[PDB]
Write an enzyme that holds these catalytic residues in place. Structure first.
Site, PDB file in Angstrom:
ATOM      1  N   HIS A  14       0.829  -1.196   0.000  1.00  0.00           N
ATOM      2  CA  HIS A  14       0.000   0.000   0.000  1.00  0.00           C
ATOM      3  C   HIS A  14       0.857   1.237   0.000  1.00  0.00           C
ATOM      4  O   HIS A  14       0.346   2.369  -0.114  1.00  0.00           O
ATOM      5  CB  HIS A  14      -0.963  -0.026   1.203  1.00  0.00           C
ATOM      6  N   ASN A  21      -5.970   7.294   4.850  1.00  0.00           N
ATOM      7  CA  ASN A  21      -7.330   7.805   4.722  1.00  0.00           C
ATOM      8  C   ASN A  21      -7.470   9.304   4.996  1.00  0.00           C
ATOM      9  O   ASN A  21      -8.561   9.854   4.875  1.00  0.00           O
ATOM     10  CB  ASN A  21      -8.279   7.012   5.628  1.00  0.00           C
ATOM     11  N   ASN A  68      -8.628   4.316  -0.482  1.00  0.00           N
ATOM     12  CA  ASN A  68      -9.097   5.331   0.454  1.00  0.00           C
ATOM     13  C   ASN A  68      -8.188   6.554   0.529  1.00  0.00           C
ATOM     14  O   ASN A  68      -8.604   7.618   0.984  1.00  0.00           O
ATOM     15  CB  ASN A  68      -9.293   4.709   1.835  1.00  0.00           C
ATOM     16  N   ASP A 117      -0.619   2.523  -5.256  1.00  0.00           N
ATOM     17  CA  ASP A 117      -0.762   1.102  -5.554  1.00  0.00           C
ATOM     18  C   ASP A 117      -2.093   0.842  -6.248  1.00  0.00           C
ATOM     19  O   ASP A 117      -3.117   1.422  -5.884  1.00  0.00           O
ATOM     20  CB  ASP A 117      -0.667   0.266  -4.278  1.00  0.00           C
TER      21      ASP A 117
END
Length: 193
Positions: free
Chosen positions: A22, A70, A116, A95
Site C-alpha cells: 500500500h 485515509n 481510500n 498502488d
C-alpha cells in the site's frame, strides 16, 4: 500542456507499514527523490515529507503524506493550497489492485477504486478538478474481503521485484510526465513489456 508542479506518493507512515504493498506510491516518490538528488524534509505544516527540484524554470515538489492513508487529502490540500497548485498540475502515485506487479499506467480523473487515499484526496480537492494518477500494479487477492490485509502485507520477492521494474519504467517517462504530455507518456509507458 500543463506542467506538473506536485508529485504525491501515497502510503502509510511507520515501521508497521514499511515495505507493504500500500506504500507503492511512496516508494516511487522515494526513488524519484533519490534520482533527482532531492532531500525529503519532514514538514509538519504539510503533514508529510516534502522536497523540491527545478524543471524548466519552475519548482516541482515531491510529497509523501505522513498522515494515515485515509487522511492523505489533508496533506495534499495543505501543500497545494499554500503554493496555489491546481489539481491539473498534480500527479499522484499509488498502488493499483486492478493491475498485476510489473505494470504501471497513467490515468486522468476517474474514481478512487476503493483506494481510500485517492478517496480522501478527491474529497479534499473536490470532484470538479481532476488530477493525474500513476497506477502501480500490486495485484489483487481475488476476493473483496481479503483486500485490506493484502495491501497491508509485504509482497513476496518476485512481486516486489516486478513492482520495482514498473517504477523504473515510470521514471523512464518522467520527462513526458513533468511536461504534462500524458499522451506521449502513456504511449511510451503502456507499451512496456
Amino acid at each position: 500542456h500543463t506542467a506538473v508542479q506536485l508529485i504525491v506518493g501515497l502510503g502509510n507512515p511507520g515501521p508497521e507499514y514499511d515495505q507493504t504493498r500500500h506504500n507503492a506510491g511512496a516508494l516511487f516518490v522515494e526513488r524519484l527523490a533519490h534520482a533527482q538528488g532531492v532531500s525529503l524534509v519532514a514538514d509538519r505544516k504539510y503533514f508529510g515529507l516534502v522536497g523540491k527540484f527545478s524543471h524548466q524554470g519552475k519548482d516541482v515538489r515531491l510529497l509523501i503524506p505522513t498522515t494515515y492513508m485515509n487522511r492523505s487529502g489533508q496533506s495534499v490540500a495543505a501543500l497545494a493550497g499554500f503554493f496555489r497548485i491546481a489539481p491539473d498540475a498534480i500527479l499522484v502515485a499509488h498502488d493499483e489492485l486492478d493491475m498485476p506487479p510489473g505494470v504501471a499506467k497513467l490515468k486522468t480523473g476517474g474514481g478512487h477504486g476503493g483506494h481510500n487515499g485517492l478517496r480522501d484526496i478527491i474529497a479534499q480537492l473536490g470532484n470538479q478538478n481532476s488530477f493525474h494518477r500513476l497506477r502501480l500494479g500490486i495485484g489483487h487477492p481475488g476476493h473483496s474481503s481479503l483486500v485490506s490485509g493484502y495491501v497491508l502485507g509485504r509482497a513476496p520477492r518476485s512481486e516486489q521485484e516486478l513492482l520495482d521494474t514498473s517504477i523504473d519504467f515510470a521514471l523512464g517517462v518522467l520527462p513526458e510526465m513533468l511536461a504534462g504530455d500524458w499522451t506521449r507518456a502513456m504511449q511510451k509507458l503502456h507499451s512496456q513489456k
